[PDB]
Amino acid sequence: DVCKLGTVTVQPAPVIPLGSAANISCSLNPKELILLKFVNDVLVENLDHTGHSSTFQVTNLSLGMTLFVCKLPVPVCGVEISVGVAPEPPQNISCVQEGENGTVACSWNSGKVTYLKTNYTLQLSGPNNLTCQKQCFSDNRQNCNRLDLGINLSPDLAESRFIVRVTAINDLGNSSSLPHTFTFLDIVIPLPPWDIRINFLNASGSRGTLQWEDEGQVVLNQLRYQPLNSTSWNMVNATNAKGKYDLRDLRPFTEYEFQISSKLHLSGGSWSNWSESLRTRTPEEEPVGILDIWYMKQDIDYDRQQISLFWKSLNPSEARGKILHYQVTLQEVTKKTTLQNTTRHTSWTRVIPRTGAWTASVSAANSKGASAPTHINIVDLCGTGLLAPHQVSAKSENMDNILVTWQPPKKADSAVREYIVEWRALQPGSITKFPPHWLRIPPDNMSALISENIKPYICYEIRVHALSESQGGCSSIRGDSKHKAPVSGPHITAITEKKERLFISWTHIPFPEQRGCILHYRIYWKERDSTAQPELCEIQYRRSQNSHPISSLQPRVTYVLWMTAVTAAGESPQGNEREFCP
Amino acid sequence: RCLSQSRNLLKTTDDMVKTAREKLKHYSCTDIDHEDITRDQTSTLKTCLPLELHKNESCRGSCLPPQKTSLMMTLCLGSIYEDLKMYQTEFQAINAALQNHNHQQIILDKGMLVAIDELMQSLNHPYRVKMKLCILLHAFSTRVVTINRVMGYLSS
Amino acid sequence: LGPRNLSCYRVSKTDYECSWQYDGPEDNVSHVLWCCFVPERCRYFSSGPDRTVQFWEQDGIPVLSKVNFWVESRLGNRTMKSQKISQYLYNWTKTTPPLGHIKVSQSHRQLRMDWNVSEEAGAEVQFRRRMPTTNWTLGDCGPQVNMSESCLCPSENMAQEIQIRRRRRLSSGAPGGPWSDWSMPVCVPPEVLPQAKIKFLVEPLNQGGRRRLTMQGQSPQLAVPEGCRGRPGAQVKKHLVLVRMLSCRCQAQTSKTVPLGKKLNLSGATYDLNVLAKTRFGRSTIQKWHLPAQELTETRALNVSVGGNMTSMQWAAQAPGTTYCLEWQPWFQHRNHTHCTLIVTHSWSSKPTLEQEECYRITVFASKNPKNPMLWATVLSSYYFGGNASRAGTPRHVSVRNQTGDSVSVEWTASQLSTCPGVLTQYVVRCEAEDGAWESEWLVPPTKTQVTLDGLRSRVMYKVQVRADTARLPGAWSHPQRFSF
Amino acid sequence: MWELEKDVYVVEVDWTPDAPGETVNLTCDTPEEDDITWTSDQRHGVIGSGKTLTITVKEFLDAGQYTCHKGGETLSHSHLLLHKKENGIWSTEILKNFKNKTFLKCEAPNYSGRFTCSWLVQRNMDLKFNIKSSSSSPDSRAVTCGMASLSAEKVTLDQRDYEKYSVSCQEDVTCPTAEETLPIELALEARQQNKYENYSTSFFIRDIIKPDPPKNLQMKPLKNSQVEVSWEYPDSWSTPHSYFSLKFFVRIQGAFLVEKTSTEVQCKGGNVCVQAQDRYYNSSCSKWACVPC
Ligand SMILES: *[C@@H]1O[C@H](CO)[C@@H](O[C@@H]2O[C@H](CO)[C@@H](O[C@@H]3O[C@H](CO)[C@@H](O)[C@H](O[C@H]4O[C@H](CO)[C@@H](O)[C@H](O)[C@@H]4O)[C@@H]3O)[C@H](O)[C@H]2NC(C)=O)[C@H](O)[C@H]1NC(C)=O
Ligand SMILES: *[C@@H]1O[C@H](CO)[C@@H](O)[C@H](O)[C@H]1NC(C)=O
Ligand SMILES: *[C@@H]1O[C@H](CO)[C@@H](O)[C@H](O)[C@H]1NC(C)=O
Ligand SMILES: *[C@@H]1O[C@H](CO)[C@@H](O)[C@H](O)[C@H]1NC(C)=O
Ligand SMILES: *[C@@H]1O[C@H](CO)[C@@H](O)[C@H](O)[C@H]1NC(C)=O
Ligand SMILES: *[C@@H]1O[C@H](CO)[C@@H](O)[C@H](O)[C@H]1NC(C)=O
């Protein structure tokens, strides 16, 4: 062999219980002896008549396997020693069966690890002389905490009480478990069913039929169904549905997830794992809401005046589904006349003579059909000032919020039944690409809080109309949410002198220069040689205004002209300059 | 040819002896304790010599090329076969005994075992265990070196 | 007077020695060392001037028995003798200094010296170190663990000399031998090198787009002690420079290490120059030099094509087949977003980085090898204005002031295109009467902000208009100004 | 305490101050029995009476030439060495170890069965040497090699020059083998004028062999600044070169190994240099052969 320098011997055995002591005897062939003990191949331990046979007692062997080398430095021999324990009696013994067609498997807890190769056996016994047995080897690599028995006894014969036993063997000492018992009526875990489909009926998204195919012995079933709005899943129970069920009170045109679980007996068997989640598309439904339609009155001429058609849908209850068609109807109330058109967009323009009353209606035609014809009686765009309310005050505590408060008019508030509030932007001329944006507020409510379709540092125009069937009130004012100082001021373009009055004309300063609502202008003029405070004239801003008069100055003396554009939060710096000698 | 397979065998044996030196360093695997498995049909170390290195002449196959046919070198090929037979037998024994216990610190990579197997196809037709593997490797390294030498000289 | 302090001992394993010091003149001294014992048996050695007689083991000397040594010195007609000494000679051992090159390692206020000694036993160790201008200072090394030995020293700011010595300390913690001699000097350099102002010469790049840098040969001197030669403790081992180009980063990092004092060809780019010095520990420190970029005077043609989801620029490159690098830097902003490419035209997709209304610097470099800085050629770094330049080119605050009875002066603030070189070309001012019978144009250089209109007829209403012109597109007119006189 | 050769004895002394020496008996090789004179060359005067003189040795004063004498005719003599021993380990101060802490460096050029063994002496005052194969078994491998010669190489260790003695030895076997199982073991017998030293070594001649540098190196100039470097197998190396083969390291002035006799490389501004190692073992490599670009 290889230990040609003698031999080594152990007492009692290379396998020992935990914490014991071992006698190691080295013998040399007839005609210093050191011991090397290595913990997981790491040197942590170290040290002629007596050398012919040297005996040592070794204690405090650590948890694991270690090597003793008896070296005379030239080696003689050695022995590999291991320490371990008897296996713990196993606990929490359970068993599993899968449906009508499925064998029996079992699981158990082995407890502590012995750091040594052990094995387990699993005995099944039962009446009418049935028995089976299989083993499993658990070692440093493979762990046996579950096993399959491989026999599929009949699940229909559920009148037997069977016995499960698990036993553990190792080199040191055997161990057993409780002679566990199990009722066969509840050992079977059913497999999830198949062919779970959804059929749509009754032409309404609330009504559906759900089908599946499973064993006909199943008595209890549960269904999980929910949309993607929330992670919560709507559960429903059923007893003896026999493969089919009907579902009512469902949200229409909402994608749904569908899952199913089964149960063979109310007091026997066990539940079933959920099947694959099914994605189902719920068909459309006809909306029953009412959408407001907004209009404008621009007077091209007395007999060819322009009427705008505006609406906006933003909720999945009035424009639910694949909506494509819009049948618009304009009716005259005083005389029996109507005009029809088909539109695909949210805006339209029409030319009507001014004579006669108006009623504007539009439909919401999805694939299912057309919704209720949304119609609004129309009065003149701006009516009498008697019902016109007082000055609406706008306060902006946020860059994207305006609170508007309108006082009740001098006329009683009993006549007005509804208030309409509309905001738009401003242009040097006329605007039609950008739609005005609207909202409705009842007169009983005090104020209106708008926080949508609004951008700070742009001057907007708000208008409020008291809606009455005879003659509603009308008012309007300009405002912005947040404004800063303008970057600069516009130009003094044209200067003229006529009828002892000096006229200054300018152009429209562009949009980014304002950075909000421009509120007024301040024109400063002085003499060329005058270094004192220049004298000032104040102009209140009007959008249509582009010229300003000023009184006669000192003749034959030159004058210097400039101006600034002043808002509430800031002032534009000085722009261009003008010199004029009258 | 057997030459490229022999180079593969040398490379994988060098890799294995590197792994054995790294792992079984505490074991006696450094010094040499040089003793080989074979002693009777040791004609590997006496016949596997070139032509012009014979000074005293007294002391079928597929990888013997027709250009270098000889009535001597067939004995060298046969001795190589028998030595490979003994080496593979006791290496199969040591590999089988290596897994009956729970020590998995050294694992014979099957590269050299399949190299020996293909070479056989081409040519013809406790604690004692680690020490026996170590001395088997310490002789097999020089044996595969000799086989590479004689294959390179013969085939080329 | 005479001989004094006799001391014999053993040096190495098989050799011995003796030494003694004389008091008095050494003009005609002769020394004899008498050694003797009983097993009476006596022996004499003669040396004359030298005082280092050796008697190894087979010279008939006893080294395992008590012997008596004494010294007689012979002067003229007189003899004088020193004290007797009685001792063994086998264990009174003189140990060698740490033989071989002793390794020095550096750290923050730390100099660790490691050495190997032949005898594995540990021994007492002392050191003595000298500053470049002062005398020596002493210091113990203290206990150590042993094979090899280690010792410490606080690292001073400049270079210094240091020497080591040992003694075989007896097991009972007593001096068991004579003092060893000092080892060869170890000279250690300054821990941080005080860099001196080296010189560079600036050169504008030529017509081909090449500037030349030739570093001068200069180096300071470090004051060192007497024995500091042949080692890096006296002067630094080598000087070097590191050139880095922070202009075309589109490829991988390419920084070049160059020996100091040689010709180098450099581009019109921003460069980082590091001057470093490799001492016996490593690279000491850095001298920083920043090279700003310059541009060739020769304006070169470039064509662009932007719009939609497609962007390209075309020109006439010198030669295809070699990799180029293109880089975009909008000069007007703080250059927050970095955009360059490594590829005659290049095609890429439009992104909101090159579509704004600020001036862009387009820099084109021709490259041949990503390992050296010489093969990067300055094709062109030009200035461009993207987007609709006509809107931005409109002048603001046009002011007209009457000068005489037939002439006026038109002045205006410079447009956005004025501050951007290479794009603004011309100012066109149109003066036209309102009746349509007179139209005239005046041309103004971009460096002038004013113009004078002469020959204007009196009592006729005039409208004037101003725009700005570039090399590719005209500009829109300003706000018209009306005047009469 | 033993007899080294005819009429010369070597004894051992415990080289430690407080221990006593050995006692030996010397007989005059003469049948005549009477009172006789004994004298040495380390001391004057008669030291021993009678033919059998018992003398104790504990120091180098006690050893040397011992002559039994009477009248004007020299009867006989014997020679007495010593052997230093400290703490149970013999003291070796005649030879100086190499950089590798070993004493004898043996090196072979090829597989012919020949080598040379070099050692580093420390002085030259009357050194005598001997090489022999300390073989126990009849099957132990035997060398048949002779006299040692001084070599003019003065090699510097620890900034001091030591002299390399060399010997040119040749192993022999009655008929060759393919590999070597028993190592060559060699015993050295150093001797400085009284002092005696035994040294040993053991080695296979496959882990010491040192090839020779390549003999015929050329550098063929190629396009794109590439170059063809060529060498040859040294002629001192064994035959054939198919059964015994080498492995050349190539570097340009990190190196790359090849097994052909030509290589494609490119220069950098210095030299290109190759080595010649044995392809199987880590047997020590040759010295470089170079051409300057
Ligand atoms: C190199 O040096 C070593 C010393 O370190 C040396 O070992 C010594 O060898 C000699 C001879 O081989 C030993 O002397 C022998 O001692 C034994 C017992 O002590 C005796 O039995 C021997 O008796 C021989 O001589 C007798 C008288 O001639 C005969 O009658 C008898 O039959 C024997 O032939 C002999 O005295 C010596 O003890 C050792 N030293 C030790 C062990 O410390 C070694 O041999 C040298 N050579 C080599 C190649 O190594
Ligand atoms: C070891 O031997 C001693 C005496 O020989 C004995 O008392 C002891 O029980 C032994 N221990 C074992 C583990 O056998
Ligand atoms: C368990 O081990 C004990 C130990 O002697 C033995 O007596 C018993 O028969 C064993 N039982 C089984 C079932 O293995
Ligand atoms: C040396 O050894 C002798 C042996 O007797 C001893 O007396 C002496 O103290 C030792 N030391 C010195 C320094 O001599
Ligand atoms: C000392 O010897 C060791 C060998 O273990 C070597 O690694 C080291 O480089 C040597 N030199 C020193 C520590 O200066
Ligand atoms: C630039 O703006 C002017 C003024 O609006 C316009 O006439 C011209 O077409 C614009 N050009 C481009 C390329 O957008």
- In sign, the C-alpha dihedral spanning C279, C283, C287, C291 is positive
B144: which residues sit within 8 A by CB, 6+ positions away?
B6, B9, B10, B13
CATH number for the domain that contains residue C369 = 2.60.40
Domain identity same for C322 and C278: no
Q: What is the D122 CA–ligand 6 centroid distance (Å)?
A: 100
Classify A51 as helix, strand or coil: helix
The topology under which CATH files domain D218-291 is Immunoglobulin-like (2.60.40)
CB of B136 within 8 A of CB of B37?
yes
Per DSSP, the three-state class of A308 is strand
The residue with tokens 């390294």 is: B141
Beta-bridged to residue A137, according to DSSP, are A119
**From the CA atom positions of chain A, what is the Rg in Å?**
48
Give me the residue label for tokens 């090489």.
D131
Q: D2 CB under 6 A from ligand 1?
A: yes
Number of neighbouring beta carbons within 10 Å of residue A52: 14
Q: Which domain holds residue C45?
A: 2-93
Strand partners, C140: C126
Give the HSE-up count for residue D275: Cα atoms under 13 Å, Cβ half-sphere.
18
CA distance linking residue A68 with residue A75, whole number of Å = 11
- One DSSP character per residue, B91-151 reads HHHHHHHTSSSS--S----HHHHHHHHHHHHHH----HHHHHHHHHHHHHHHHHHHHHHHH
Q: Is A435 helix (H, G, I), strand (E, B) or coil?
A: coil
Instruction: Please identify which residue in the block is written with the tokens 């409780």.
Output: A178
Question: Are C74 and C131 in a shared domain?
Answer: no
- DSSP character at residue A341: E
Ligand 1 atom nearest the C-alpha of D134 is: 49
Distance from C-alpha of A566 to C-alpha of A562, rounded to nearest angstrom? 13
Return d(Cα A317, Cα A314) in angstroms, integer: 9
Residue D93 to residue C99, Cβ atoms within 8 A:
no
Task: Show the tokens assigned to B36.
Answer: 């080989």
- Residues C416, C359: contact at Cβ < 8 Å? no
C9 and C20 within one domain:
yes
Helix (H) or strand (E) holding B152: helix B128-155
In angstroms, the separation between the Cα of residue A93 and the nearest Cα of chain B is 28
- A494-580: CATH topology is Immunoglobulin-like (2.60.40)
Residue D94 one-letter amino acid: I
Structure letter (DSSP) for residue C417: T
> What determination technique applies here?
cryo-EM
* Contact yes or no for D261/D231 (Cβ under 8 A): yes
Give, in order, the Cα–Cα distances in Å from C311 to each of A495, C349, D3. 48, 6, 104
Interface check B18 vs D, CB under 8 A: no
How far apart, in whole angstroms, are the C-alpha atoms of residue D25 and residue D56?
9
Q: Output the CA–CA distances (angstroms, integers) from residue B125 to B61, B81, B101, C220, D89, in the order listed.
A: 8, 10, 35, 82, 59
Dist. CA C359–CA C130, nearest whole Å? 64
Kindly give the pairing relationship between strand A559-566 and strand C396-402.
unpaired
Query: Residue C398: which residues within 8 A CB-CB, separation 6 or more?
Result: A491, A576, C410, C412, C464, C466, C478, C479, C481
Where do the domains of chain B lie, and which CATH numbers do they carry?
2-49+64-155 (1.20.1250.10)
**Exposed / middle / buried, residue A184 (Cβ in 10 Å: 0-12, 13-18, 19+):** buried
Q: How far is CA A259 from CA A210, A231, A308, A479, C160, in A?
A: 11, 14, 51, 56, 84
Residue A78, helix vs strand vs coil: strand
Question: Closest partner residue to B128 among A3, A38, A69, by Cβ?
Answer: A3
Q: Please provide the DSSP assignment of C332-374 as one string.
A: SS---S-EEEE--EEEE---TTS-SSSEEEEEEEE-S-TT-ST
- Structure token digits, residue B71: 């009535």
Say how far apart CA A315 and CA A323 lie, in whole Å.
Answer: 13
Gap between the Cα atoms of A249 and C368, Å rounded: 74
Question: CB–CB of C243/C269 below 8 Å?
Answer: no
Q: Are A76 and A28 in contact (CB under 8 A)?
A: yes
A376 to A293, A305, A310, A318, A360: CA distances (angstroms): 7, 19, 12, 16, 5
Q: B133: Cβ–Cβ under 8 A, 6 or more apart, which residues? A: B20, B94, B98, B106
CA dist A438 and A418 (Å) reads 13
The answer to whether residues A175 and A167 touch, using CB atoms and an 8 Å cutoff, is yes
Rounded Cα gap, residues A468 and A417, in angstroms: 7
Does D244 touch chain B if contact means CB atoms closer than 8 Å? yes
Name every residue whose Cβ is closer than 8 Å to that of residue C17 and which is 6 or more positions away in sequence: C8, C9, C10, C11, C52, C53, C54, C94
Residues of D whose CB is below 8 A from B45: 177-179, 181
**How far is it, in rounded angstroms, from Cα B59 to Cα B46?**
7
What DSSP state is assigned to residue A87? P
Distances from the Cα of C392 to the Cαs of C98, C416, C468, in angstroms? 81, 6, 9
CB–CB of C430/C411 below 8 Å? no
**Cis bond upstream, residue A193 (ω within 30):** no
CB-CB: which of B44, B59, B149 is closest to D243?
Answer: B149
PDB resolution in Å: 3.6
DSSP D143: B
Amino acid at B116: I
Nearest-CA distance from D219 to chain B in Å? 28
Would the CA dihedral through C34, C35, C41, C47 be positive or negative?
negative
What is the DSSP code (8-state) at residue A89?
A: P
Instruction: Give the separation between CA A486 and CA A488, rounded to whole angstroms.
Output: 6
Question: Both tokens of residue A252?
Answer: 């229409």
Question: Residue A422 corresponds to which tokens in the numbers above?
Answer: 């509309």
3 state SS of D230 = strand
Token readout for A497 is 């002198």
What residue spans in chain A does CATH classification 2.60.40.10 cover?
Answer: 6-83, 91-188, 190-280, 297-376, 393-479, 494-580
Instruction: Tell me whether residues B152 and D177 touch, CB distance under 8 A.
Output: no
- D-chain residues within 8 Å CB-CB of B47? 178
Q: Which residues are paired to C129 by β-bridges?
A: C137, C162
- β-strands C93-94, C2-11 pairing: parallel
Does the domain at residues A6-83 carry the CATH identifier 3.40.30.10? no
CB atoms near residue D165 (< 10 Å):
20
Give A139-147's long-range contacts (Cβ < 8 A, gap of 24+): A139/B102, A140/A115, A140/B102, A140/B104, A141/B104, A143/A110, A144/A110, A144/A119, A144/A120, A145/A107, A145/A108, A145/A109, A145/A110, A146/A105, A146/A106, A146/A107, A146/A108, A147/A105, A147/A106, A147/A107, A147/A120, A147/A122
- CA distances (Å), origin C355, targets C349, C384, C470: 12, 11, 18
Question: What Cα–Cα distance (Å) separates residue B33 from each residue in A199, A209, A370, D183?
Answer: 84, 85, 100, 11
Contacts of C225 (CB under 8 A, 6+ apart): C130, C131, C132, C159, C160, C161, C187
Rounded Cα distance, A261 and A276, in Å? 11
Q: Using CA atoms, how far apart are residues A424 and A431, in angstroms rounded to an integer?
A: 10
Helix (H, G, I), strand (E, B), or coil: what is residue D148? strand
Chain A positions touching chain B (beta carbons under 8 Å): 1-3, 36, 38, 41, 43, 65, 67, 69, 75, 77-80, 82, 116-117, 139-141
Q: Rounded distance, CA A311 to CA A328, Å?
A: 12
Short-list A17, A10, A59, A52, CA closest to A33 = A52
Do C324 and C382 fall into the same domain?
yes
C470 sits in which H/E element = strand C462-470
The single residue listed with the structure tokens 């019109």 is C268
Instruction: Transcribe A150-211 into DSSP letters.
Output: -----SS----EEEEEEEEE-SS--B----EEEEGGG-EEPPP-EEEEEEE-TTSTT-EEEE
Residue located via tokens 């073991």 = D185
Among A505, A491, A488, A497, which residue's Cα sits nearest to residue A562? A491
CA distance C375 to C265: 9
Separation of alpha carbons A378 and A383, rounded Å: 12
Residues 6+ apart with CB under 8 A from D160: none
Question: Directed axis angle between helix B2-23 and helix B128-155, to 10°?
Answer: 150
Element (H, E) at A139: none
Same domain, C369 and C315: yes
| Angle at the Cα of D219 from the Cα atoms of D214 and D224, rounded to 5 degrees | 145
C-beta separation of B59 from B72 below 8 A: no
| Residue B78, strand partner residues | none
Q: Report the number of secondary-structure helices (H) and strands (E) in chain B.
A: 5, 0
| A572 contacts: CB under 8 Å, gap ≥ 6 | A485, A486, A487, A488, A489, A513, A564, A565, A566
Domain boundary among C188, C222, C239: C188
CB A193 within 8 A of CB A275: yes
DSSP, res C169: B
Residues in a beta bridge with A467: A418
Rounded CA gap, A421 and A473, in Å?
A: 12
The CA distances from residue C251 to A32, B123, C291, C327, in Å, are: 68, 56, 21, 11
C83/C9 same-domain check: yes
Domain assignment present for residue C202? The answer is: no
Please report, to the nearest 10 degrees, the dihedral formed by the alpha carbons of residues B100, B103, B108, B113 taken in order: -10
Angle between helices B73-97 and B110-123 (to 10 degrees): 150
CATH number of A393-479: 2.60.40.10
Cβ contact, residue pair A491, C482, below 8 Å: no
Give the DSSP H/E element, type plus range, for residue C203.
none
Instruction: Compute the radius of gyration of chain B from its Cα atoms.
Output: 17
Beta bridge partners of D119: D165
- Rounded Cα gap, residues B129 and B24, in angstroms: 12
Centre a 10 Å sphere on the Cβ of residue C68 and count the other Cβ atoms it contains. Answer: 14
What is Dmax (Cα atoms) for chain B? 53
CA distances to A8, A571, B117, C343, C382 from A326, rounded to whole Å, are 102, 49, 84, 54, 57
Q: Which CATH number is C47's domain given? A: 2.60.40.10
Question: In A235-318, which residue ranges form alpha helices assigned H by DSSP?
Answer: none
Instruction: For chain D, give the number of residues.
Output: 293
The H or E element spanning position C64 is none
* Whole-angstrom distance, CA of residue A394 vs CA of residue D76: 143
Q: Are A222 and A236 in contact (CB under 8 A)?
A: yes
Please state, in angstroms and rounded to a whole number, the distance separating the CA atoms of residues B28 and B128.
11
Backbone φ and ψ for D13, nearest 5 degrees, come out as -130, 135
Q: Which CATH superfamily is domain A297-376 in?
A: Immunoglobulins (2.60.40.10)
Q: Which CATH architecture has domain A190-280?
A: Sandwich (2.60)
Count of C-beta atoms within a 10 Å radius of residue A430: 6
User: With the C-alpha atoms ordered D247, D252, D256, D260, is the resulting torsion angle positive or negative?
Assistant: negative
Q: Is there a contact between A202 and A248 (Cβ–Cβ < 8 Å)?
A: no
Are the CB atoms for A258 and A225 separated by under 8 Å?
yes
> Phi/psi at A487 (nearest 5 deg)?
-70, -40
Cβ burial of B45 (10 Å; 0-12, 13-18, 19+) is: buried
Q: What is the CA radius of gyration of chain C?
A: 44
Largest CA distance in chain C: 151
Query: Which among A433, A312, A436, A334 has a CA at the least distance from the CA of A379?
Result: A334
Q: How far is CA A499 from CA A496, D257, D277, in A?
A: 10, 108, 117
Closest CA to C301 of C286, C287, C312, C317: C317
CA-to-CA distance for C415 and C420, rounded, in angstroms? Answer: 10
Map out the domains of chain D as residue ranges.
2-86, 95-203, 218-291
Q: What is the CATH number of domain D2-86?
A: 2.60.40.10
Instruction: Domain A91-188: give its CATH architecture.
Output: Sandwich (2.60)
Q: Which CATH number fits domain D95-203: 3.40.50.1000, 2.60.40.10, 1.10.10.10, 1.10.540.10?
A: 2.60.40.10
Count of beta carbons in the 10 Å neighbourhood of residue A252: 17
Asked if residue D91 has its Cβ within 6 Å of ligand 1, the reply is: no
Cα D83 versus chain centre, distance = 19
Dig out the tokens for A173 from the structure. 């000492």
Min Cα–Cα distance to chain D from C48, Å? 24
Neighbours of D268 (CB within 10 A): 10
Nearest Cα to Cα of residue B7 among B151, B156, B155: B151
Taking the centre of ligand 4 as the mean of its atom positions, its distance from the CA of residue C67, in whole angstroms, is 13
Q: Which of C423, C417, C418 is nearest to C362 (CA)?
A: C423
Tally of domains in chain C? 5
CA distances from A459 to A481, A484, A541, C26, D48 (A): 8, 12, 13, 115, 139
A575 to chain C: nearest residue by CA?
Answer: C397
